[PDB]
Structure 1
Amino acid sequence: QIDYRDVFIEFLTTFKGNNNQNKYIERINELVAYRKKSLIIEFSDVLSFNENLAYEIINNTKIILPILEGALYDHILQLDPTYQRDIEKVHVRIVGIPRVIELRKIRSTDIGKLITIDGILVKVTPVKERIYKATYKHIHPDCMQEFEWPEDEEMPEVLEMPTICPKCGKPGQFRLIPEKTKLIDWQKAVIQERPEEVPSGQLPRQLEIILEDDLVDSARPGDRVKVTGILDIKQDSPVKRGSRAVFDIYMKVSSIEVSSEEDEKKIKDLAKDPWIRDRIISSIAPSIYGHWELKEALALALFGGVPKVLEDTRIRGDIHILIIGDPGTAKSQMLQFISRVAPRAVYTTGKGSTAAGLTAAVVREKGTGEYYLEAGALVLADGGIAVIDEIDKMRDEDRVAIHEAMEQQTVSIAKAGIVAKLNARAAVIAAGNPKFGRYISERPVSDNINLPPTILSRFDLIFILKDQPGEQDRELANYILDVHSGKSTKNIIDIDTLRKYIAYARKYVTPKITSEAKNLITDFFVEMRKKSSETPDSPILITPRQLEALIRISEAYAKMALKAEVTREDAERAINIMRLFLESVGVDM
């Protein structure tokens, strides 16, 4: 009756964007440039342009989608005839569907229609190949005939061989020819519901999703995704009877998105403020009163330094923080916020974690009895932040397992005939209590901390928190009561904007040390060593690691302002913050 082929073509070439630039024309041209084969379409734009087409897509997806894909191919084909013989067909993916269903609310009425699901990826299988059009040869001394079996039909997910030879009308034995068989990429992944959606008491549930063609390897485990596609039932051996007419549910993904130009200008405008550093610092844990030096230190760990990769060695660029404090000083509240604003973070505790779970585990799969590696907490946090609450409660024989990952940023395993090395480039933030629960001033600093000097040298900054009831109790009491009353602080960057800001900085900014910063850093390091040698009593050691901590911190300060060079101003701040760190552990500079 009505053809949407023209409307779809009209929509793509005639659609004014936010800045009136025909964004979809630009997207198509970018697709031809690198042969992307996949085009992303916003549902809202289709609804804004022509509503009638929008309902057709969301309600008749299984029919109208192949029609649009063919129409798009011709339009691209006209733009570039050379697009052939490298790409044979394209894919149209739709995002922004309003039909969002919780993973626990799926019922029979939701099967067969395009829906959207939000969850967490937990398992990804290696990419494999699926046959969708096989080629067979009849093994019968008369035939020697080659044919494609699923004629006029895509081969189903259950393989089936012909029973009668089409070219001779005889039964017999058929042989598959891999050379003439058509294949498509295939990957299986498992999604899990968010903890915020799990009801009280029960464990989270899981759903199986299938990724095909270019959708494979689109995300890594631990990511938060929004999948869109068609639900369907799952079968393994339909021929194998014995009742059991009960089937599971699997999700046939058509478009996946993880976690725009408008953000860049929004981010770029933020960096133009001269007081951007102070605004960022004041935006860390707005619900916590005071602890200005601690808030500043946590900001540095989020940005980090510049890792240096050389032809012979590599230098760690991550910043590690240690906090020791009396109970009730909001150590854990701050760590919770960090795991929320960090683009990638893993939260663990000292008691609830083991040496094998922190780095890597060797397990025997019951399917084959063969040992294989399992990623640990530090490995999964690669490129992110690892948070280790209650570090003092962790067994010492287990805590030593992270010494290598803290400095060399690798995990080495030699167990059960498996020798492997895994990257663990993650920043470690840890908190804990002193030896006797509360800090005791009479005893020396050495026995209060109760940690080996080997692990203390691996932390760039160490802060000791003391809860002394003084004149600020009234200020603290009023601040807390305001939080419980719903009153909040304004003129602070929200979490979502801040998370976008940090991710941009860690990807496009790489400061360089200038000569002016070199002299200041060198002079202060020499001063450190002389002071430390004078008093060989403090439990901390001024090793060459402390010199590199100055370099890492200096780059982080420059990175927070999206600067390209480490000026003298950043060097002074880096020296200043470590002066406070040294004062905390009782070293007077």
Structure 2
Amino acid sequence: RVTLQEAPGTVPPGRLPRHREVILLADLVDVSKPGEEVEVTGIYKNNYDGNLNAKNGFPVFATIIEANSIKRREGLDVFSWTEEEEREFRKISRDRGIIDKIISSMAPSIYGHRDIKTAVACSLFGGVPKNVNGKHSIRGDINVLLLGDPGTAKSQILKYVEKTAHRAVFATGQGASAVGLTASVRKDPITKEWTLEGGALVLADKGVCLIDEFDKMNDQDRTSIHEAMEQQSISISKAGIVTTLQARCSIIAAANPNGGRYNSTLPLAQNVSLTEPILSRFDILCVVRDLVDEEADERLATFVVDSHVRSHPENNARQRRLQRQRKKEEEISPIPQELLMKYIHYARTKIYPKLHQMDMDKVSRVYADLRRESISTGSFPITVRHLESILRIAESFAKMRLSEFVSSYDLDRAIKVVVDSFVDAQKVSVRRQLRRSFAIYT
């Protein structure tokens, strides 16, 4: 038995949703889980209930739907692909600069912030989790923290990746709590034994957990995410249901600096109220800066106005509509969005790139130089966590080409990404020296 409730969007403005109880017989049990949108076709039956008559005071009959078929809510699923499509993906991957097209085709409606696009694409593609004889576990998820000035197209990118990602959960810092991020306990109406619900992090396992207005969350809730960030598991102890739950999901967080703006002079430590541990746990830290420049502002204004005019509601019949929609989509995206959505799923499912052989000394030298130049006061020490992130980003980049050999180009590009992310976070005074020293990598 499941409880079906009306979709919040369908409900007229500020009215109570209406719910019924659906009975699933053999061959239909365990076909849906809480938090799904479904369509139920069945027989609407009624029966005499003494309790209802005693309570209401009139001869009213209980009603329930005896399910005959359940479906999820184009077709059945966009993420599903066919053998014919799998041949198209291999052809596309053969493109010499497919990675650049993937990055460009991501959030085309947003003009700038190419570093954001690179980082978020890497996070979406994900890494390859690794285990060593059951003694050492390495996370494969990639965490990205977005920080910058108020108007910079931050929340919109998270909203986009919510749609693009296979299994994604969107939560806001203000509207969240630890109980809703880990699990909630209910009482089973049949067995009368306490069961345990799934949380926001649990619902997004093997997916992405997007958090907006991250800095606004309370300390306890921000601690609730420490475990999922690194331990990749959430422990619960309520009502004698002690157990451990699986939570292996990547986290993309957006926040604005403390005080409302990023003082380029001061370091990232004082700018944001997050503690040093959580800041370290993040792989790529794409700091966003909103300065003033005539040419850049001209280009931005032109692009924004063109985007607004292009999306005006006024600007077979269904086939013609699809054709014009494709015209616009190709207008702003070198690759159609529909193909990219299936591409992400196929890459995350079938391809697990591995490092066969590559000149370690390159990344070792980069690590040594990072440590040499990071001793300066005001710069967080470059711990091995950066070296791990380099490898993770390299694996993700190789996943873009659907190639199981991590070539040199991908490793150098990952080095560039990590080095730029570290350099931008530091103060101006140290920024000058860091930019001077690092030339080959960037």
Name the stretch that deviates more: 282-291 or 413-422. Answer: 413-422
- In structure 1, the partner of 2:364 is 522
Distance 1:251 1:433, change over 3 A: farther
- In structure 2, the partner of 1:71 is none
Give 1:263 shift.
2.8
Q: What does residue range 75-90 of structure 1 map to in structure 2 within 5 Å?
A: none
Structure 1: distance between partners of 2:404 and 2:102? 19
2:41 is the alignment partner of 1:229: yes
TM-score norm. by structure 1 comes to 0.63
Structure 2: distance between partners of 1:582 and 1:460? 10
Give 1:397 shift.
3.0
Q: Which amino acid aligns with 1:457?
A: S
Q: Which amino acid aligns with 2:14?
A: G
Q: Choose the corresponding residue for 2:65, options 238, 246, 250.
A: 250
Name the stretch that deviates more: 393-402 or 265-274. Answer: 265-274
Give 1:516 shift.
0.9
- In structure 2, the partner of 1:189 is 2
- In structure 2, the partner of 1:317 is 140
Structure 1: distance between partners of 2:169 and 2:205? 10
Q: Give deviations 1:493-520, integer Å, cap 9, x for gaps.
A: 3333222111111110000013215443
Structure 2: distance between partners of 1:536 and 1:220? 52
- In structure 1, the partner of 2:309 is 485
Give 1:406 shift.
0.5
- In structure 2, the partner of 1:537 is 378
Distance 1:370 1:255, change over 3 A: closer
Q: Is the partner of 1:232 in helix, strand or coil?
A: strand
Q: Choose the corresponding residue for 1:410, options 233, 244, 255.
A: 233
Give 1:317 shift.
0.5
Distance 1:478 1:192, change over 3 A: farther
Give 1:365 shift.
7.4
Q: Choose the corresponding residue for 2:288, options 443, 465, 474.
A: 465
Structure 1: distance between partners of 2:165 and 2:216? 25
- In structure 2, the partner of 1:337 is 160
Name the stretch that deviates more: 408-417 or 260-269. Answer: 260-269
Contact 1:294-1:463 at 8 Å conserved across structures: yes
Distance 1:375 1:230, change over 3 A: closer
Q: Choose the corresponding residue for 1:426, options 241, 249, 254.
A: 249
Q: Is the partner of 2:197 in helix, strand or coil?
A: strand
Distance 1:265 1:202, change over 3 A: farther
Give 1:561 shift.
1.3
Across the aligned residues of Structure 1 and Structure 2, the Cα RMSD in angstroms comes to 2.7
Structure 2: distance between partners of 1:578 and 1:212? 54
Distance 1:406 1:203, change over 3 A: farther
Q: Which amino acid aligns with 2:420?
A: L
Contact 2:22-2:64 at 8 Å conserved across structures: no
Q: Is the partner of 2:285 in helix, strand or coil?
A: strand
Q: Is the partner of 1:339 in helix, strand or coil?
A: helix
Distance 1:293 1:195, change over 3 A: farther
By percentage of residues, which structure has more helix? 2
Q: Which amino acid aligns with 2:340?
A: L
- In structure 2, the partner of 1:218 is 31
Structure 2: distance between partners of 1:233 and 1:210? 11
Structure 2: distance between partners of 1:265 and 1:566? 22
- In structure 1, the partner of 2:110 is 288
Q: Give deviations 1:47-77, integer Å, cap 9, x for gaps.
A: xxxxxxxxxxxxxxxxxxxxxxxxxxxxxxx
Segments of structure 1 that go 5 or more residues without pairing to the other structure are 1-187
Q: Is the partner of 1:498 in helix, strand or coil?
A: helix
Name the stretch that deviates more: 468-477 or 319-328. Answer: 468-477
- In structure 1, the partner of 2:123 is 301
Contact 1:281-1:299 at 8 Å conserved across structures: yes
Structure 1: distance between partners of 2:101 and 2:163? 18
Q: Which amino acid aligns with 1:544?
A: V
Give 1:426 shift.
0.7
Give 1:277 shift.
1.2
- In structure 2, the partner of 1:582 is 422
2:408 is the alignment partner of 1:568: yes
Structure 1: distance between partners of 2:51 and 2:181? 45
Percent identical: 43
Q: What does residue range 61-460 of structure 1 map to in structure 2 within 5 Å?
A: 188-202=1-15, 204-206=17-19, 208-225=21-38, 227=39, 229-235=41-47, 237=49, 243-250=58-65, 252-254=67-69, 256=71, 259=77, 260-310=82-132, 311-362=134-185, 372-460=195-283
- RCO comparison, higher one (Cα < 8 Å, 6+): 2
Q: Which amino acid aligns with 1:467?
A: D
Contact 1:389-1:431 at 8 Å conserved across structures: yes
- In structure 2, the partner of 1:170 is none
Structure 2: distance between partners of 1:577 and 1:204? 48
Distance 1:275 1:244, change over 3 A: farther
- In structure 2, the partner of 1:499 is 341
Structure 1: distance between partners of 2:51 and 2:226? 55
Distance 1:240 1:516, change over 3 A: closer
Distance 1:196 1:502, change over 3 A: farther
Give 1:261 shift.
2.8
Structure 2: distance between partners of 1:322 and 1:497? 27
Structure 2: distance between partners of 1:383 and 1:377? 13
Q: How many pairs does the alignment contain?
A: 399
Segments of structure 2 that go 5 or more residues without pairing to the other structure are 312-327
Distance 1:357 1:236, change over 3 A: farther
Q: Which amino acid aligns with 1:298?
A: V
TM-score norm. by structure 2 comes to 0.82
- In structure 2, the partner of 1:112 is none
Give 1:207 shift.
5.0
Distance 1:368 1:193, change over 3 A: closer
Q: Which amino acid aligns with 2:173?
A: G
Distance 1:354 1:241, change over 3 A: closer
Give 1:213 shift.
3.3
